[PDB]
Structures are given as C-alpha cells and as structure tokens.
C-alpha cells in the first residue's frame, strides 16, 4: 500500500514536479501567467482567458506575462492556484486527493505564506497530508553529506545556511535578495549602451535567454576588462527571433559580476562570497574547519561558467591560509533541491512527520509553524 507522494518545487522562476522515489522530475515548466493585450476580431475561434506555463511562452507575442512569485514571496494567489492546478491535472494527470504533497520555500519569509499555502492545499485540493520544507536542507540532502554549508541562489532569492551533524544553526542563516531577475534587469540596463532596446515582457524573456546562453563569470575582472577593451576576441553573435543579429562583446562578464559586487546595482550589501564567509564566521569556532571543506552550491543562478573557481579564490583570500577550501558543485545542481525531496518523502520515519487533515481541523492553518522548521 505504498503510494508515491507528490514532490512539487515552486521556485520563483520555474516550477518542477514529480513522484517520490524517482530520480528526475516528471514535469518542469516556467511559472508564468499570461493574459491577452490586443483586440480579437475573428469570431468563431475559442476564447481563452489565461495562458499558463509553456503555452504562455509559445504565444508570448500577444500576451502580458506576470510572475505569481517574485523575491521568494507569492503575491497573486489565484495565479498560483492556476499554476498548481495545471501542474496536477495537465502535467502529471493524477488525483490530488489521493497522494500527499511536499512543498519548498525560502528560509526567511512572511509568516502568512505558510498558513495560506496550508489552507489552500487542504481546502481547494483536499489533500490527505502535506509538509513544507526549506530548499537548502533538501539541497544538503541531495548532496549526500550530513554536514556542510548550503548556498542556494534561485530566480528570486539567495540564502546560506550552515548545518553541522544534522543540527542547523538558525542565528547564522543569511538571506540576500540578489538573484537572476536583478541580473536580467541589469542586462537590460547595460545592453542599451550598444544601442539595443528591450522594453516589454517578451523582450524580458529574450534577454533572459541571452543571459542564459552567452554569459560567464570572470576570474579576474580588471584583467578581463583590459583584454576586452584592447581587442575583440571576447565577442559573440546572437540573432533574435525576428532575424536581426546582435553582438554582445564586453557585456558578457559584466552582468554576472553583479553577484560578487552589488555596488553595480546600487545595493550596499556584500557579495555572495562575503555573505558565505560572514555566515561561516557567525558559527562556533570549533565547527568552521568542517564548514570550509563542505561548501555546496545550488540553484540555477550558480550555473554560470567559471563560478566555482572565482568562489574558491575569493573564499581562500578571505579565509586564513592554513585551512583548506573545497567547493562542491554537482553538475545537476539546478534540480538538486527537488532531488532532496525525492529522498525526504522516501524515508521510513518521515511518515510520522506528515501534517494530517485531522490536526488541521483541530488547530487551523497555524499547525505549520509547530510542525515545520
């Protein structure tokens, strides 16, 4: 009588879903809700109010695109309900009232998000049980080690947590609001120098594709700037769906550099490397050596080429030169959080950790604070 519990990762950018005990997610699609913005003149065709997922991406040329989740916090709840319904009924084709579900969220969040998620999922979808986990803990589960520091950077939020021997330290958890959306906006702001104008949401998707395809992190920023200014080896050509060909040139490595120096975006906060160092140094003096040797990267934002070498060099510069620094970035890091779910719902003891419907009926939507970390 073993039923596969659904594992659904609702990130800021893209939504993933699958069954517990599997290796890879069954459904992966962008979390974009689109609405028409032009006049319809052909009477006879079917009318469709909203476009959800890849169907919004295919016909994005006549739609306004909105993200239901930005900066790790969901604002438009009806769009999120539509995303969940499209996930359950069109991408997995399973009855939601039969299987338990597992969801992910950022470490530091507004308190009402968990309660609203619990209320929606027991009332609208009528699930037997659910659980809300933290994405970095699942990343550490998928890493296969008990101890280490997890730096997860998604599309809306970045967070670092330290864990030693399965005991998490809550006072050293660091949350920084720098992610891929700000990088896309900065790429919009710096592509204007070459004369290319991108203004609408379809242009946002095009610029996001450009950033995904032709960006990399410089090992040395001033060396790369001098080399790019002096010659023209660092130039690549990308052609738009219209057919015009654009050349990026210098802007390939300037946009990824906003992660390490947030002064480019106007933020006064420190870089990701100094954030990790400050999170480590806030821990105890005895467990820092193990945290140096088990640094784990996660999230799609850390998918840029040359990110691990720059991270290791910066941390080695910050850290004392006796302790030996190893960075651990698996090649399939982008789905790693979801992979952690495939372990978390597969354990024998985790069947005693589900939030039953009966406990919800006793204690309202506030049971999630008592039963979830």
């Amino acid at each position: 009588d073993d039923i596969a519990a659904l594992v659904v990762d609702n990130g800021s950018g893209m939504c993933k879903a699958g069954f517990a005990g599997d290796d890879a997610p069954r459904a992966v699609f962008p979390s974009i809700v689109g609405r028409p913005r032009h006049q319809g003149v052909m009477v006879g065709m079917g009318q469709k109010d909203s476009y959800v997922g890849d169907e919004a991406q295919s016909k994005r040329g006549i739609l306004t695109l909105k993200y239901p989740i930005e900066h790790g916090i969901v604002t438009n709840w009806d769009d999120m309900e539509k995303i969940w319904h499209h996930t359950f009924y069109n991408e997995l084709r399973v009855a939601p009232e039969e299987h338990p579900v597992l969801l992910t969220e950022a470490p530091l969040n507004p308190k009402a998000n968990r309660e609203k998620m619990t209320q929606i999922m027991f009332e609208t979808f009528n699930t037997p049980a659910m659980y809300v986990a933290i994405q970095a803990v699942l990343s550490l589960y998928a890493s296969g080690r008990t101890t280490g520091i997890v730096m997860d950077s998604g599309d809306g939020v970045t967070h670092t947590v330290p864990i030693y021997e399965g005991y998490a330290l809550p006072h050293a958890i660091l949350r920084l609001d720098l992610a891929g959306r700000d990088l896309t906006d900065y790429l919009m702001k710096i592509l204007t120098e070459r004369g290319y104008s991108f203004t609408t949401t379809a242009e946002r998707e095009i610029v996001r594709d450009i950033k995904e395809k032709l960006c990399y992190v410089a090992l040395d920023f001033e060396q790369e700037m001098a080399t790019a200014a002096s010659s023209s080896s660092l130039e690549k050509s990308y052609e738009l769906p219209d057919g015009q060909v654009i050349t990026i040139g210098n802007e390939r490595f300037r946009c990824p550099e906003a992660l390490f120096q947030p002064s480019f975006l106007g933020m006064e906060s420190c870089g990701i490397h100094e954030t990790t160092f400050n999170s480590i140094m806030k821990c105890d003096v005895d467990i820092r050596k193990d945290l140096y040797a088990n640094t784990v990267l996660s999230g799609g934002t850390t998918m840029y080429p040359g990110i691990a070498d720059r991270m290791q060099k910066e941390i080695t510069a910050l850290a004392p030169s006796t302790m030996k620094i190893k960075i651990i970035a698996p090649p399939e890091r982008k789905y790693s959080v979801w992979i952690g779910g495939s372990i978390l719902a597969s354990l024998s003891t985790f069947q005693q950790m589900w939030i039953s419907k009966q406990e919800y009926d006793e204690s309202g939507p506030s049971i999630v604070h008592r039963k979830c970390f």
């Binding site: 002096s230 010659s231 023209s232 080896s233 130039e235 690549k236 050509s237 060909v245 050349t247």
Partner: protein, 66 residues
Amino acid sequence: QKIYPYEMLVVTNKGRTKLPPGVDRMRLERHLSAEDFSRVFSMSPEEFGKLALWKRNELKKKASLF
C-alpha cells in the same frame, strides 16, 4: 615574421572560424606584408609608428583586423 593573405586574417564574428595557428590575437597587422599593408592602410609602417594608440585601433576597426 609570419606571412598571410589579407581577408583571411579579417576576423568576422559571424563566422567564428578562419583563424591561423600560432598568432597572437593582440596584434595581427604586423604579420601583414608591406605591400599588402600599404594596400590596406595607404601609409607606411613608420608613420603608422608615430600614430597614437586610439587612432591605430580605429584603423584596425576600419580594416576589420580588430
């Protein structure tokens, strides 16, 4: 003292090919011969020697050797 023809050393970002081996990317116009150089830039290597760095780079950009 590598010697090569002209428009094969012209580097187009569209093609991403036609690069010769063992040449430094930084300074390609030195390897051009004197008569081909005088065809391209209409000026001697000496008075190209006095020219300022930005003007020289603009000459490279005009001849697509930059």
